[PDB]
Amino acid sequence: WAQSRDEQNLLQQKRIWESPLLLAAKENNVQALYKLLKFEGCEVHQKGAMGETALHIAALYDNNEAAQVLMEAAPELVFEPMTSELYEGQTALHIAVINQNVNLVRALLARGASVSARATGSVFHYRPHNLIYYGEHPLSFAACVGSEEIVRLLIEHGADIRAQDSLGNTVLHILILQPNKTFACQMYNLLLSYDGGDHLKSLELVPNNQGLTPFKLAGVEGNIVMFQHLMQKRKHIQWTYGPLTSTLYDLTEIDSSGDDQSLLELIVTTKKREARQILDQTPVKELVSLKWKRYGRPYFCVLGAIYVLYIICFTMCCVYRPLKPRITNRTNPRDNTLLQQKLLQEAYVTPKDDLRLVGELVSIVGAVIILLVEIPDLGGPFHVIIVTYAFMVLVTMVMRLTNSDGEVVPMSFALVLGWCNVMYFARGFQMLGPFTIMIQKMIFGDLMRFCWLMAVVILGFASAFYIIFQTEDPDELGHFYDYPMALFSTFELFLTIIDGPANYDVDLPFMYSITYAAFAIIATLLMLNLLIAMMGDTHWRVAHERDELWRAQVVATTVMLERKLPRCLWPRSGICGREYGLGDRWFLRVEDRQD
């Protein structure tokens, strides 16, 4: 698809070269323009390859003299938008605004150009393949390019600031998505002065079609500069007392008020890395930290203590299980067999099995609640693990209820998952907090990078160890008799977790001494590289990534508790405005100091 527009741009330049009219507009050849329009009368409405006019060409190459001649010789061309699918809707005013050609904009002003004309072309979509997203309307273009002169010049002649684009985004939303934040704060504040000024229907409330006001979009986008500028509207100051300044914050669109209206939920859900810094801002970081110090951290330790007691109950119900009498003469055939197994299907004997019978009941009623609080639908893995645990005890109470021969196969998956899920609560206390973040980011990151190389390497040498020690009885030295144990043992030789095949009472094969020497050297090389490849994330920037991503996870956890927990526990943060001078809304007191 990228070649299509490249072909069409090269095709356009060919049609610019072929068409002498469009050529004179590109080169500003005013002397040639008259000869083609008067002395050898051609079509002045001559369309280009992009459905453009000679005026559309004279617009992007900033030569007003060629555009002036076309609008004087045919004032019908101004209203015409480009008809091609790439550039559909773009008038000659759009190009004049985005190129900051103020004189062409003011000349198209006198022609009565459409200020409400929508540029719906595929090159104006908010997509990665478009280098920028300036919007739909020419007023949106004037605000994004950073020309306050064109913004006011457009509003003077009927430009509607409320006009929402293809994605229902107002011009205020579009300024948040721009790069130059420090300058665009004046443009945002400038555009708001033209608003009606009524307390209702203010343009700061007109939301994106994805339910997002401009103040709320700044947080999700990670625009730290706009979010601070957008905070002064929502900031009340109680008093100034020496160096201290008790300031009262609004907390309306911030914090858990509605379902998905809360900014905090939008910050933790969005994948934007910059959005985590809105959490560290003065109005919010004081909120979430106080939501954590009280009603946040204690309940997380309660659920932690409950879960630890819930699992240590289920774990204690797994060490004590129905007895496993071999009771078969199958143990003598196939010396490899090493099992004493099975159930005898009875839990009704009522001695001390009733203690683990209610322990099994607690596990099932706990799992069905776990499966009925999570499946009704970052700390993702440590929440998928919980439902797979509940899934694994629904396969350790159903197939195990019907007397399965291998009923311990899914009980081990249930055990390690829910047990290693306890360090989910490691984000509770500060010491273990950032440590659990480091192990999680390193699994998807650096485990795959070394495991695929380890897999390719062990596959090489485990096969070369199979092929040599298949040519030998495994009664002695039999470290890898068949291919499953060939991959398993060599995988273990790779991690120094076996003594390595070593038998000296009897002689070894000729090639093992040579092959394992190369293996031990490559095994340590890849092991040292694995040690120093994950070392790369020890930079001073990562030190913040170690700490902040834990805080971001704690705040993400802090919202996870309050959203589902009842209202009687954990009251609404801040103090309500009713019974005070304010108006039934909840505000946060934060006093600081300036040195």
Ligand X SMILES: C[C@@H]1NC(=O)N[C@@H]1CCCCCC(=O)O
Which residues are part of a known binding site for Ca(2+)? Answer: 499
* φ and ψ of 569, to 5 deg: -85, 150
The arrangement of strands across the sheet holding 244-249 comes to 235-241, 244-249, 586-593, 575-576
Binds 131: which of ligand X, Ca ion, none (CB < 5-8 Å by kind): ligand X
367: exposed, middle or buried (C-beta count within 10 Å: 0-12, 13-18, 19+)? Answer: buried
Nearest distance in Å: CB 59, ligand X: 8
Nearest distance in Å: CB 90, ligand X: 7
Please choose, out of 52-60, 227-235, 386-394, 436-444, the segment that lies near ligand X by the rule CB under 6 A.
52-60
Please choose, out of 123-131, 164-172, 534-542, 549-557, the segment that lies near ligand X by the rule CB under 6 A.
123-131
Other Cβ atoms less than 10 A from the Cβ of 419: the count is: 17
Pairing between β-strand 244-249 and β-strand 586-593 as defined by DSSP bridges: antiparallel
What tokens does 235 get? Answer: 């900031």
Q: Which is nearer to ligand X, 104 or 267 (CB)?
A: 104
Residues making up the binding site: 499
* Given 4, 103, 116, 130, the residue binding ligand X (CB under 6 A): 130
* Given 2, 131, 237, 319, the residue binding ligand X (CB under 6 A): 131
Q: Which residue is nearest to Ca ion (CB)?
A: 499
Binds 2: which of Ca ion, ligand X, none (CB < 5-8 Å by kind): none
Binds 323: which of ligand X, Ca ion, none (CB < 5-8 Å by kind): none
* Given 22, 123, 151, 437, the residue binding ligand X (CB under 6 A): 123
| CA geometry: angle 469, 472, 474, nearest 5 deg | 85
Q: Which is nearer to Ca ion, 307 or 480 (CB)?
A: 480
Nearest distance in Å: CB 152, ligand X: 25
DSSP structure class, residue 426: G
Report yes or no: 145 and 98 within 8 Å, Cβ to Cβ.
yes
Binds 52: which of ligand X, Ca ion, none (CB < 5-8 Å by kind): ligand X
Nearest distance in Å: CB 60, ligand X: 5
370-399 positions binding ligand X, by CB under 6 A:
none
Nearest to 256 by CA among 238, 268, 247: 268
**Could you tell me what percentage of the chain is helix, strand and coil, using 3-state DSSP and rounding each to the nearest 5?**
55, 5, 40
Q: Which is nearer to Ca ion, 499 or 579 (CB)?
A: 499
Report yes or no: 105 and 80 within 8 Å, Cβ to Cβ.
no
Q: Which is nearer to Ca ion, 403 or 524 (CB)?
A: 524
Q: Does 56 bind ligand X (CB under 6 A)?
A: yes
Between CA 270 and CA 583 the distance in angstroms is 31
Site residues for Ca ion per CB under 5 A: 496, 499
Q: Which is nearer to ligand X, 134 or 512 (CB)?
A: 134
Between CA 258 and CA 102 the distance in angstroms is 45
* Dihedral of the alpha carbons of 336, 337, 339, 343, in degrees to the nearest 10: 160
Binds 584: which of ligand X, Ca ion, none (CB < 5-8 Å by kind): none
- What contacts 24+ positions apart, CB below 8 Å, involve 241-247? 243/593, 243/594, 243/595, 244/591, 244/592, 244/593, 245/591, 245/592, 245/593, 245/594, 246/589, 246/590, 246/591, 247/590, 247/591, 247/592
Site string for ligand X, 64-103 (x = CB under 6 A): -----------------------x----------------
Binds 123: which of ligand X, Ca ion, none (CB < 5-8 Å by kind): ligand X
Between CA 167 and CA 393 the distance in angstroms is 46
Nearest distance in Å: CB 186, ligand X: 25
Nearest distance in Å: CB 86, ligand X: 7
Q: Which is nearer to Ca ion, 335 or 499 (CB)?
A: 499
Nearest to 428 by CA among 557, 310, 308: 557
Q: Does 60 bind ligand X (CB under 6 A)?
A: yes
The stretches of 63-213 forming alpha helices (DSSP H) are: 64-73, 92-98, 102-110, 138-145, 148-155, 171-176, 181-193
Q: Does 469 bind ligand X (CB under 6 A)?
A: no
What tokens does 155 get? Answer: 């509003």
Binds 238: which of ligand X, Ca ion, none (CB < 5-8 Å by kind): none
46 HSE (CA, 13 A, CB side):
20
Q: Which is nearer to ligand X, 131 or 338 (CB)?
A: 131
Size of the site for ligand X (CB under 6 A): 8
The crossing angle, in degrees rounded to 10, of helices 353-371 and 297-319 is 130
Nearest distance in Å: CB 518, Ca ion: 19
* Given 23, 33, 50, 487, the residue binding ligand X (CB under 6 A): 50
List beta partners, residue 249.
235, 588
Binds 499: which of ligand X, Ca ion, none (CB < 5-8 Å by kind): Ca ion
Binds 524: which of Ca ion, ligand X, none (CB < 5-8 Å by kind): none
Q: Which is nearer to ligand X, 114 or 122 (CB)?
A: 122
Binds 130: which of Ca ion, ligand X, none (CB < 5-8 Å by kind): ligand X
Binding site for ligand X (CB under 6 A): 50, 52, 56, 60, 87, 123, 130-131
